[PDB]
Amino acid sequence: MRKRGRQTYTRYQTLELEKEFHFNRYLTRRRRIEIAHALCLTERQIKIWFQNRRMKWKKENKTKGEPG
Numbered sequence: 001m002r003k004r005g006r007q008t009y010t011r012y013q014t015l016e017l018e019k020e021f022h023f024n025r026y027l028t029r030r031r032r033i034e035i036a037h038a039l040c041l042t043e044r045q046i047k048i049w050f051q052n053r054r055m056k057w058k059k060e061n062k063t064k065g066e067p068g
Contacts, residue, residue, distance in 0.1 A: 004045065013039050017046070021053050 007014075016039055020027075027035065027050055032043045041049075 001047075004048070009049075013041070014049075017049055017053070021050060025054060026056070040044075 009017075017035075020035060024031065027046065032046055035046055036043050037042065
């Protein structure tokens with residue numbers, strides 16, 4: 001059993017997510033199956049970590065704040 005929300009991930013586990021995200025900032029069905037297996041994570045929690053990793057990119061990266 002796992003409780004979600006509370007990360008409790010290894011630096012390594014998150015490192016492989018970070019190397020994976022750096023290469024590919026969107027994950028496919030197939031690649032998630034590989035990823036889930038690889039880090040013994042689940043696609044749901046990978047979605048959460050990837051969603052976190054791309055928040056503050058795909059909602060800040062350039063984006064002039066005030067329209068003008």
